[PDB]
Design a protein around this ligand. Structure first.
Ligand SMILES: *[C@@H]1O[C@H](CO)[C@@H](O[C@@H]2O[C@H](CO)[C@@H](O[C@@H]3O[C@H](CO)[C@@H](O)[C@H](O[C@H]4O[C@H](CO)[C@@H](O)[C@H](O)[C@@H]4O[C@H]4O[C@H](CO)[C@@H](O)[C@H](O)[C@@H]4O)[C@@H]3O)[C@H](O)[C@H]2NC(C)=O)[C@H](O)[C@H]1NC(C)=O
Ligand SMILES: *[C@@H]1O[C@H](CO)[C@@H](O[C@@H]2O[C@H](CO)[C@@H](O[C@@H]3O[C@H](CO[C@H]4O[C@H](CO)[C@@H](O)[C@H](O)[C@@H]4O)[C@@H](O)[C@H](O[C@H]4O[C@H](CO)[C@@H](O)[C@H](O)[C@@H]4O)[C@@H]3O)[C@H](O)[C@H]2NC(C)=O)[C@H](O)[C@H]1NC(C)=O
Ligand SMILES: *[C@@H]1O[C@H](CO)[C@@H](O[C@@H]2O[C@H](CO)[C@@H](O[C@@H]3O[C@H](CO)[C@@H](O)[C@H](O)[C@@H]3O)[C@H](O)[C@H]2NC(C)=O)[C@H](O)[C@H]1NC(C)=O
Ligand SMILES: CCCCCCCCCCC
Ligand SMILES: CCCCCCCC
Ligand SMILES: CCCCCCC
Ligand SMILES: CCCCCCC
Ligand SMILES: CCCCCCC
Ligand SMILES: CCCCCCC
Ligand SMILES: CCCCCC
Ligand SMILES: CCCCC
Ligand SMILES: CCCCC
Ligand SMILES: CCCCC
Lengths: 81, 102, 115, 285, 329, 128
């Protein structure tokens, strides 16, 4: 739920004017803040295991989606000259 | 140890009681197993410790005896019981069997 | 649990043959693999035993040197090598295995040898 | 005449040996020359202020009623179970803080009674000795952790300890230490305890431990060294960039607070100021 | 009862076999029941083994009136009446017997006085770690066996001539062991004043699985360094974007430096896991310094610097990956 | 001598994925025949006894092959039981706490299903 709440909150950047660069980029960086922290906490009580787990391909994929959210507005500034 | 079966060939009709004596050499007193080897196949296990049965063996095979003198027993001989029967001691390291009974 | 041996063998005197015992169903380094000899006219006879993981073997006093037990965990198979083959070696060779005791409840189909 | 009759004539049944009476009872004190052999020195704890050492405590003395004439041997390595019916000096470690024999496959005890009575006694002991650490200059400090081989129930007119004249403390080859480098010089002085009951014997062995600042220079200094120089670039952007510039200052001044708080992972919470917390306070400034 | 009570009578467990004669030969053997993973924090590892010993003791020669199978399997609690080699483990921090229903011991006494004793131990052995090239390293932990109270004149160990160590399946969390060198039968220790003491050791090799670190350290750290590169295509007038976008790349990298070393020993030398983080921490900081160079250029066409930096750091960084992963891997 | 044995687990808990083990205390019972304990003196079928008498009879030396740490319970007495049936049948119940180790396959960690084992194995006596 907390990680689900972060992926679902980074999407609001598209519900903001394309001029608010500090807003969207500040949002795309704050969201990737907790995801790296949430993903780091996912291995709190787990042994250091080589293979990939079920929760690990969930935090990684939510991290990838939240990472691509911030990466989009970097593609908008280049376009929206 | 020298296990011995003093009857290489036994005669029996379908539905008889036959006893196969395997007189051990020294005192093992429980260590005896009985095998059945139809022609052209591996000897399958029937009895181990002289009184127990193996997983999937018909209940007409009964082991008895102790000390030196042992004995296998088939209550009602069917048609498949016409084969070779080996006794076997598993008490010591050199595991002799004792020839075979037919 | 099953034990799949090699095929029939035909050798000449003085040579040496190696019979395999392909354990299909369990790790070969798990149980003792026993080796027996069935010579027609006579009865069965116990060759020895090899725990295929620790390389421990307990040969019969009659077969010391005549038989050599080996193993190979790359394919889960236990080997036996008969050196100095003679006409007395004409018999069938099995690779039994006793799990809950010193009896032989798992057997191989057999490997006919004819010197 | 027999190996069993000999041990029964030297100890046990037909000996008359009494392990409750020190050698030369009502005579000169039993001097005990003793040396150590450290196996695994290390695990210097800072939050607990103690270290763990594995040593073979060898201690030699002379018991005149263990002198034999039967065997022509100079010494005689007895069994490691017969060093329980002989007298033994009852030394403890004054700052041991936890200790235990090793009893794996046999009691790790050694006994060797020479022909004139000279007894040897080697036992393997894992100690968790306590050494009070001075952290006035923490990352670059030089410690001095000691062990004290003290007697308990015998005064200095009954039992006197000493060190081996040559090589009293011996270190195993290749004995390394993380964060530390055990200096080859070791002080061997006479501690002596005067208690409410009388004079008691003691002998300590100083251990000098120079700290290796490789860890703290990569973990504590460079990250703080980098965060400080991070904020310096705030002086280059245009002054009109109010939110961006202040964001650079707030994060850098905030990250130094986390670094200083993280600089006390294993450091004991001590009153005075260290040498690492005035590099952090100054970089925080 | 007279098969055993007739032997131990007149038997002395304080005297080794062949007291003044040749030394006693002990053929050491080991079965690894479980092999715990290395504790990098304490430089040790926990192992559960079945220590086996096999020496000769001519006073335990079974009579001619004993048939038996081949041995004389006796009460395991009967070990206290026989002589036993006093071998300790020169690396163990804290070992342990096992008595879960009663004490786990074998005692076979063959017909020629030969004796077998199989203790069941759980050892916490200490093996120093060489954490240079940390995630892609490989350690070698020892299991030195050694006599304590008997010199080489009296007691003498030697490994089993076949397979001394009999590990079957361990499958550590992030390690693995296949085949190694049961070496140094001449491991005999020399101690001043006491003498030469027997030693025999097995030095296992423990390769480390980098799978846990490729998705817990290298994977998330790599995207953060790419996260810093997003600030090059953004309009340079947005001061409040490229600056916060760069501070994140140093803050998160700085945080990962402490979070990773928090569960490792504090060795004072750069390891491979630190060259990666310290390098990525500089590519992030270098991108932020790049903005200051561009911000100054506006104080006077600074887009050329970003353009020259758009396709330079990815080249300057991918060049790092070739150099890094070729050295340590 | 074969020993039909059963277990009564009082509690699991502390199932650590990190340590890769779990703790449990059980009442390991085990019965076997001992023909030199049959008696004709008392007319009782079964006959409870003092657990202090439990140290003078034969007992199978079973261990837990993956026990990883265990200990008897000595609180206020030996937590041992012994009733010698009047034909030789010896009952033997002892309380034991076990930190058994079970390797965990965490391929689907948050919603996995584990299978931790408990191997009661003999040590000093062969299969015959
Ligand atoms: C000690 O070791 C031994 C061996 O190593 C263990 O062996 C146990 O042996 C018993 C038999 O003695 C066995 O119980 C059998 O189960 C079979 C089913 O798997 C039954 O087929 C078998 O025969 C009886 O039941 C059949 C089906 O009802 C009848 O057709 C058959 O005639 C038998 O019935 C006889 O006995 C019943 C009940 O007494 C009665 O109706 C009549 O008297 C009739 O004559 C046996 O029931 C066990 O399964 C074996 N053990 C195991 C674990 O499998 C033994 O358990 C070990 N322990 C002890 C304490 O001995
Ligand atoms: C417990 O207490 C006992 C006795 O109190 C101690 O035993 C005595 O130890 C002392 C010294 O530790 C002995 O005294 C000296 O021994 C020296 C032996 O070393 C050699 O030195 C030279 C060089 O090799 C040789 O020439 C010499 O022969 C020795 O082989 C001697 O050197 C000493 O005598 C020489 O030096 C002195 C001083 O220069 C001269 O005056 C002499 O003429 C001679 O040239 C001296 O003898 C002493 O012998 C020991 N026994 C006794 C009964 O005192 C224990 O050490 C102590 N600790 C224990 C037991 O743990
Ligand atoms: C190698 O292992 C052996 C352990 O046996 C150690 O050295 C060897 O053992 C002893 C020395 O501890 C030597 O025994 C000697 O044998 C000769 C034979 O004539 C005898 O005359 C002597 O009285 C003595 O008993 C043995 O020779 C020696 N082996 C050698 C020297 O080759 C030693 O701990 C290990 N390391 C080495 C030898 O470098
Ligand atoms: C860590 C210092 C990196 C400085 C790089 C120089 C500035 C970039 C210039 C690109 C033309
Ligand atoms: C702190 C970096 C400043 C770089 C300024 C470069 C001016 C040419
Ligand atoms: C990686 C997907 C980001 C969106 C790109 C659309 C041009
Ligand atoms: C020792 C680390 C050096 C990294 C260089 C990065 C440019
Ligand atoms: C991610 C690297 C993109 C290079 C584009 C070249 C202009
Ligand atoms: C480990 C050395 C890496 C240096 C990289 C320089 C670009
Ligand atoms: C006692 C020294 C204090 C210095 C603080 C900067
Ligand atoms: C001694 C550490 C050097 C890191 C750059
Ligand atoms: C899974 C290994 C990848 C190495 C770069
Ligand atoms: C998991 C590494 C992939 C290399 C591009």
């Amino acid at each position: 739920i907390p990680s689900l709440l972060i992926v679902i909150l980074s999407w609001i950047s598209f519900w903001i004017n394309m001029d608010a660069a500090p807003a969207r980029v500040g949002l795309g960086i704050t969201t990737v803040l907790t995801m790296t922290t949430q993903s780091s906490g996912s291995r709190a009580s787990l042994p250091k295991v080589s293979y990939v787990k079920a929760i690990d391909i969930w935090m990684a994929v939510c991290l990838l989606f939240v990472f691509s959210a911030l990466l989009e507005y970097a593609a908008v500034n280049f376009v929206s000259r | 140890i020298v296990m011995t079966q003093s009857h290489k060939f036994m005669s029996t009709s379908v539905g008889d009681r036959v006893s196969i004596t395997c007189k051990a050499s020294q005192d093992v007193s429980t260590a005896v197993a009985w095998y059945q080897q139809k022609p052209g196949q591996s000897p399958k296990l029937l009895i181990y410790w002289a009184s127990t049965r193996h997983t999937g063996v018909p209940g007409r095979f009964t082991g008895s005896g102790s000390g030196t003198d042992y004995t296998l027993t088939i209550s009602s001989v069917q048609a498949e019981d016409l084969s070779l029967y080996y006794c076997q001691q598993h008490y010591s390291t050199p595991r002799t069997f004792g020839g075979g009974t037919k | 649990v099953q034990l799949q041996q090699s095929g029939a063998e035909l050798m000449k005197p003085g040579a040496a043959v190696k019979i395999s015992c392909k354990a299909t169903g369990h790790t070969i380094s798990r149980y003792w693999i026993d080796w027996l000899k069935q010579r027609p006219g006579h009865g069965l006879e116990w060759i020895g035993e090899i725990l295929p993981g620790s390389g421990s073997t307990n040969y019969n006093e009659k077969f010391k040197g005549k038989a050599t037990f080996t193993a190979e965990k790359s394919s889960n198979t236990a080997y036996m090598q008969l050196s100095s083959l003679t006409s007395e070696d004409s018999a069938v060779y099995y690779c039994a295995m006793g799990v809950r005791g010193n009896y032989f409840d798992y057997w191989g189909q057999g490997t006919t040898l004819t010197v | 005449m027999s190996p069993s009759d000999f041990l029964d004539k030297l100890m046990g049944r037909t000996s008359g040996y009494d392990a409750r009476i020190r050698p030369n009872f009502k005579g000169p004190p039993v001097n005990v020359s003793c040396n150590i052999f450290i196996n695994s020195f290390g695990s210097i704890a800072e939050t607990t202020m103690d270290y763990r050492v594995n040593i073979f405590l060898r201690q030699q003395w002379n018991d005149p009623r263990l002198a034999y004439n039967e065997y022509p041997d100079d010494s005689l390595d007895l069994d490691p179970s017969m060093l329980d019916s002989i007298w033994k000096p009852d030394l403890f470690f004054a700052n041991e803080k936890g200790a235990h024999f090793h009893e794996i496959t046999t009691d790790n005890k050694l006994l060797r009674i020479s022909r004139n009575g000279n007894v040897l006694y080697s036992i393997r002991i894992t100690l968790t000795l306590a050494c009070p650490m001075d952290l006035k200059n923490f990352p670059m400090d030089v410690q001095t952790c000691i062990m004290q081989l003290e007697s308990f129930g015998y005064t200095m007119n009954d039992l006197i300890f000493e060190w081996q004249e040559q090589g009293a403390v011996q270190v195993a080859d290749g004995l390394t230490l993380p964060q530390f480098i055990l200096k080859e010089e070791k002080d061997l002085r006479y501690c002596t305890k005067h208690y409410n009951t009388g004079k008691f014997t003691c002998i300590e062995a100083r251990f000098h431990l120079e700290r290796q600042m490789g860890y703290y220079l990569i973990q504590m200094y460079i990250p703080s060294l980098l965060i400080v120089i991070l904020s310096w670039i705030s002086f280059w952007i245009n002054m009109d960039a109010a939110p961006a510039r202040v964001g650079l200052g707030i994060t850098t001044v905030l990250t130094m607070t986390t670094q200083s708080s993280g600089s006390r992972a294993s450091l004991p919470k001590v009153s005075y100021v260290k040498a690492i917390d005035i590099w952090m306070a100054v970089c925080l400034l | 009862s007279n098969i055993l009570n007739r032997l131990l009578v007149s038997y002395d467990p304080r005297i080794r076999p062949n007291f003044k004669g040749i030394p006693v030969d002990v053929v050491v053997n080991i079965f690894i029941n479980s092999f715990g993973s290395i504790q990098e924090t304490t430089m040790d590892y926990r192992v559960n083994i079945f220590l086996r010993q096999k020496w000769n003791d001519p006073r335990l020669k079974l009579p001619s009136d004993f048939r038996g199978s081949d041995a004389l399997t006796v009460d395991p609690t009967m070990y206290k009446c026989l002589w036993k080699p006093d071998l300790f483990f020169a690396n163990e921090k804290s070992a342990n017997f096992h008595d879960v229903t009663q004490e786990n011991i074998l005692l076979f006494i063959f017909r020629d006085g030969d004796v077998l004793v199989s203790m069941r131990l759980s050892i916490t052995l200490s093996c120093p770690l060489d954490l240079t090239l940390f995630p892609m390293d490989t350690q070698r932990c020892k299991m030195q066996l050694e006599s304590f109270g008997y010199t080489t004149d009296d007691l003498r160990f030697i490994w089993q001539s076949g397979d001394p160590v009999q590990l079957e399946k361990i499958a550590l969390p992030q390690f693995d062991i296949k085949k190694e060198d049961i070496e140094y039968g001449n491991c005999t220790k020399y101690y001043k004043g006491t003498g030469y003491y027997t030693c025999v050791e097995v030095i296992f090799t423990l390769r480390r699985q980098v799978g846990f670190y490729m998705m817990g350290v290298y994977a998330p750290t790599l995207l953060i360094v790419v996260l810093s590169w997003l600030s090059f295509w953004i309009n340079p007038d947005a001061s409040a974007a490229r600056v916060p976008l760069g501070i994140f790349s140093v803050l998160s990298l700085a945080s990962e430096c402490t979070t990773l070393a928090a569960e490792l020993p504090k060795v004072s030398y750069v390891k491979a896991l630190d060259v990666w983080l310290i390098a990525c921490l500089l590519f992030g900081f270098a991108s932020l310094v790049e903005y200051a160079v561009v911000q100054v250029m506006l104080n006077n066409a600074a887009k050329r610097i970003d353009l020259y930096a758009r396709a330079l750091f990815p080249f300057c960084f991918l060049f790092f990956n070739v150099i890094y992963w070729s050295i340590y891997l």
